[PDB]
Amino acid sequence: GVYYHKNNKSWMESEFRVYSSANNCTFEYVSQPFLMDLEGKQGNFKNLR
Amino acid sequence: PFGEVFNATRFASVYAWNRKRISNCVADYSVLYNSASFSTFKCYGVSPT
Amino acid sequence: EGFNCYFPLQSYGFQPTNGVGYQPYRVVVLSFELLHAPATVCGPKKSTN
Numbered sequence: 001g002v003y004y005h006k007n008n009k010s011w012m013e014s015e016f017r018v019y020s021s022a023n024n025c026t027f028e029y030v031s032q033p034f035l036m037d038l039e040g041k042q043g044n045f046k047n048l049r
Numbered sequence: 050p051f052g053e054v055f056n057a058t059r060f061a062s063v064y065a066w067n068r069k070r071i072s073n074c075v076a077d078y079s080v081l082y083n084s085a086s087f088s089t090f091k092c093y094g095v096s097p098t
Numbered sequence: 099e100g101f102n103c104y105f106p107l108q109s110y111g112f113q114p115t116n117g118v119g120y121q122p123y124r125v126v127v128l129s130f131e132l133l134h135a136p137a138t139v140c141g142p143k144k145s146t147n
């Protein structure tokens with residue numbers, strides 16, 4: 001979830017309730033760092049992944 | 050992170066022991082007896098060395 | 099025989115009462131070279147003319 005707030009023009013998480021909890025974790029990881037555009041402007045798909 | 054488990058302030062009781070998880074990391078044996086001088090170190094089915 | 103010192107010699111606990119597997123068995127191994135030289139040792143036979 002992302003919202004366009006009038007007071008600050010940025011996109012914050014609204015409800016990160018994807019899951020309830022975790023009983024146990026066999027494995028956890030963080031992938032190499034990289035960056036994102038985070039723009040809501042309308043248009044054709046400028047990139048393919 | 051054996052050191053944090055090994056060097057801890059308090060440990061649980063025998064009836065309510067603490068179960069933990071070691072996953073996707075690397076252990077060692079040479080960091081067990083260099084001035085550790087514990088009561089008893091032994092292993093079953095394989096030499097601790 | 100202190101820390102990092104362990105005793106090479108070991109002693110059994112043989113008594114009538116210990117489990118069947120734990121009972122002592124006495125093993126006699128028999129070895130011999132495969133007739134490389136005209137030796138003497140062999141079993142009962144009859145000298146044929």
Ligand SMILES: *[C@@H]1O[C@H](CO)[C@@H](O[C@@H]2O[C@H](CO)[C@@H](O)[C@H](O)[C@H]2NC(C)=O)[C@H](O)[C@H]1NC(C)=O
Nearest residue numbers: 051052053055056057080081082083084085086
């Ligand atoms: C956790 O305990 C061990 C000892 O069991 C500490 O490791 C010591 O590290 C230094 C490195 O030169 C040396 O003194 C020995 O290798 C270890 N100890 C002794 C007593 O000789 C380790 O640093 C402890 N962690 C702490 C205090 O946070």
